[PDB]
Symmetry: C4
Subunit: 93 residues, 4 copies
């Protein structure tokens, strides 16, 4: 429950940090832009600009396959154990 | 059931309104284009043009993580409690 | 089962046909390109080119919200009742 | 369990190989770029560049509809039977 959500949160944070480091150093992007790219790639939203370095593409494939499940599980647990109870409470008379 | 679908609908509407206000004022887009961006970002479809303001990127990350679960739950409930019964009725002899 | 998959298939086909007609007439795209746009939008994959007509954007929002659930349910049923049994049979000794 | 995950892995690998061959020969892309395109299309992440050949678009539609279910099932099973036990073990005192 609580510990599960917190573990998922920390795991997603570390994964996003790794992706940001990668895309800011290897690819050469700015830190916030690298974070945006990581989020949009792990959330399947997408971006206009794409990687160019072959190492970047390899890491992108592995990163998707490694972190999509984690990010989407974190979203599911955030909606089921954080957003839903909050809405239920703020909808009580 | 009905109240659940309506609550999800109103929540999605308010979230989309917030996103539209943000992207139309801060980013500087037109209202309908801001609504399209919000929908495509919360639905994971995507867009060709991306945010440019750092504040915009921060809000985009938080907006995705806050509204993807809501939008997709609304889609699920719309398909299970609105689309499915309608199809079943219009498929009855 | 079978009838469910077939109904989902026909519904997805009609939805894609409607989207193709729209994007080929109003937007002004070629039929196959309109079909590709409809598929990539209902499947959340994405595209490089985006709508430009305000009517196009309205229809895109409504089309996403109306057909994402249908397309993804069709994919789920195709994987559970068509792909999975086929793989099980072709994996039998 | 184990055999299920391995079968899904091999199926995804073969599907990605087919997509890479297609996009590297017909479309004319480089092998790693074709693999990236296949991954981003089957994972619904997206890409900046889109197909141009009509045959390419037909194959893209069929490829999405044929492999999205497989790729996402592989991701689900990888998260439930590989990532989750590993995290549980590395979180044990
Ligand atoms: Na361009
Ligand atoms: Na683009
Ligand atoms: Rb997506
Ligand atoms: Rb996408």
């Amino acid at each position: 429950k609580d510990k599960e959500f917190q573990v998922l949160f920390v795991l997603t944070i570390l994964t996003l940090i790794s992706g940001t480091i990668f895309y800011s150093t290897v690819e050469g992007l700015r830190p916030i832009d690298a974070l945006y790219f990581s989020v949009v790639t792990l959330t399947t939203v997408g971006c206009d600009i794409s990687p160019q370095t072959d190492f970047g593409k390899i890491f992108t494939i592995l990163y998707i396959f490694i972190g999509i499940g984690l990010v989407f599980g974190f979203i599911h647990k955030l909606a089921v154990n954080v957003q839903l109870p909050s809405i239920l409470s703020n909808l009580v008379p």
